[PDB]
Amino acid sequence: GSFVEMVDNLRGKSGQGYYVEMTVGSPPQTLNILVDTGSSNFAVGAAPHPFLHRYYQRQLSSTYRDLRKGVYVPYTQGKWEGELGTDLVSIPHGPNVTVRANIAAITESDKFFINGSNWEGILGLAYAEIARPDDSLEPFFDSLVKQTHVPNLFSLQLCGAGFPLNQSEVLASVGGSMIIGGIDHSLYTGSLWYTPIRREWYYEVIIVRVEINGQDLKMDCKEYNYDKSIVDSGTTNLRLPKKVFEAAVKSIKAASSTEKFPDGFWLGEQLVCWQAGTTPWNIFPVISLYLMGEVTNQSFRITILPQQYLRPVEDSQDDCYKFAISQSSTGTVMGAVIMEGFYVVFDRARKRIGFAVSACHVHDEFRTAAVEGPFVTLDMEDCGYNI
Ligand SMILES: CN1C(=N)N[C@](CCC2CCCCC2)(C[C@H]2CCC[C@@H](NC3CCCC3)C2)C1=O
Numbered sequence: 276g277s278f279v280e281m282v283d284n285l286r287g288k289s290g291q292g293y294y295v296e297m298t299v300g301s302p303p304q305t306l307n308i309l310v311d312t313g314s315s316n317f318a319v320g321a322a323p324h325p326f327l328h329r330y331y332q333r334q335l336s337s338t339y340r341d342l343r344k345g346v347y348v349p350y351t352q353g354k355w356e357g358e359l360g361t362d363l364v365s366i367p368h369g370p371n372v373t374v375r376a377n378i379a380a381i382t383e384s385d386k387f388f389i390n391g392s393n394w395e396g397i398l399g400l401a402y403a404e405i406a407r408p409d410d411s412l413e414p415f416f417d418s419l420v421k422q423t424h425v426p427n428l429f430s431l432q433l434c435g436a437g438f439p440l441n442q443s444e445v446l447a448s449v450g451g452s453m454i455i456g457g458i459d460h461s462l463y464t465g466s467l468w469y470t471p472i473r474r475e476w477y478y479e480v481i482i483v484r485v486e487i488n489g490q491d492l493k494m495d496c497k498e499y500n501y502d503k504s505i506v507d508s509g510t511t512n513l514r515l516p517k518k519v520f521e522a523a524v525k526s527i528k529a530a531s532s533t534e535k536f537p538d539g540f541w542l543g544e545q546l547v548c549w550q551a552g553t554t555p556w557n558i559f560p561v562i563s564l565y566l567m568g569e570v571t572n573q574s575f576r577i578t579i580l581p582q583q584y585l586r587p588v589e590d591s592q593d594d595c596y597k598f599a600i601s602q603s604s605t606g607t608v609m610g611a612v613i614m615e616g617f618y619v620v621f622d623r624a625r626k627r628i629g630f631a632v633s634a635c636h637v638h639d640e641f642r643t644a645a646v647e648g649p650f651v652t653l654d655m656e657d658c659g660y661n662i
Contacts, residue, residue, distance in 0.1 A: 284368035300336030313507030319396030321380030353386030437637035463618035463631035488560035496658035510610035514603035575648025
């Protein structure tokens with residue numbers, strides 16, 4: 276329906292993350308927390324760090340409970356270490372409830388905090404299977420559902436501005452919505468289409484076909500999900516398995532061949548700039564990902580524009596971007612730049628993820644993002660990778 280209290284409760288951007296305000300402890304300690312659908316721990320800065328202007332102070336909370344256990348979490352881009360405990364947690368622009376949740380108090384980290392991101396912790400919204408140190412550490416959303424009458428579903432509208440936001444602008448700007456326990460109809464246009472959650476660990480999905488400007492990439496669909504495909508708000512880019520990335524970049528280069536870009540642009544390292552207002556969107560192709568539907572032999576597609584996969588960056592008055600599609604050795608990752616095109620419903624109760632065109636997606640007068648279906652698609656279970 277309508278969830279006014281939660282609409283516009285996010286801030287941030289694809290490159291540094293989208294975050295929501297939360298409170299921890301008694302009296303409440305306010306912290307900004309990264310919304311991360313790609314992990315399952317609630318972990319917050321709990322000791323001084325050069326990039327933090329506030330942190331969780333356990334000694335000032337009367338409701339803090341020490342679990343007397345450490346946690347070490349190495350990830351490819353960095354690491355975080357901490358001390359486990361529980362405390363009372365609330366979301367001010369959320370459901371009007373307080374829950375007792377697990378909190379990892381971060382004591383040491385490497386490439387975790389981002390200078391100028393304005394967040395002090397992460398909210399891992401995925402399932403207990405990938406919680407650290409193990410699946411006995413109940414994730415936040417599981418605690419929320421178990422302790423309250425909040426429905427077992429949340430939905431995300433991540434709003435890319437379509438241009439760079441300076442330090443002051445990114446702090447003052449509305450970055451989107453996290454609707455806890457429901458679907459807000461004002462955040463999308465058209466219909467919601469659902470794909471099954473293949474397995475409850477990451478938010479795993481199955482891609483069954485890929486097109487670049489309607490041209491089929493024509494790879495064995497297992498390649499698209501090798502070794503998994505996930506929906507992850509805590510990754511910036513659309514990341515594709517090595518072989519898929521090579522074929523997709525070849526096709527995107529061919530479609531955009533009226534302009535030549537340096538190798539560093541395609542590697543997602545170097546920015547490209549155009550005179551103010553002259554970005555040649557029309558030379559870049561749309562990308563369609565077909566996802567398994569809820570009905571046997573049925574799929575649907577989500578279509579993104581270059582306004583999603585070209586990420587705005589500051590250089591001058593030029594309009595500059597980085598290519599936000601990159602290679603992966605751990606499967607497809609539908610990151611924040613893809614999520615910015617859509618309202619995404621994480622329907623845990625019905626083991627499915629919904630997509631609809633976002634009411635805040637960036638587009639031009641000639642093209643828009645799309646969510647369309649149905650399409651007849653056979654042997655879709657064969658697209659899933661095993662082992
Ligand atoms: C890709 N990915 C995530 N989605 N979460 C983590 C942990 C994954 C866990 C590791 C343990 C196993 C299960 C998966 C850490 C998180 C830390 C803070 C920074 C953030 N990325 C920034 C924020 C926005 C863009 C880039 C990454 C990660 O590596």
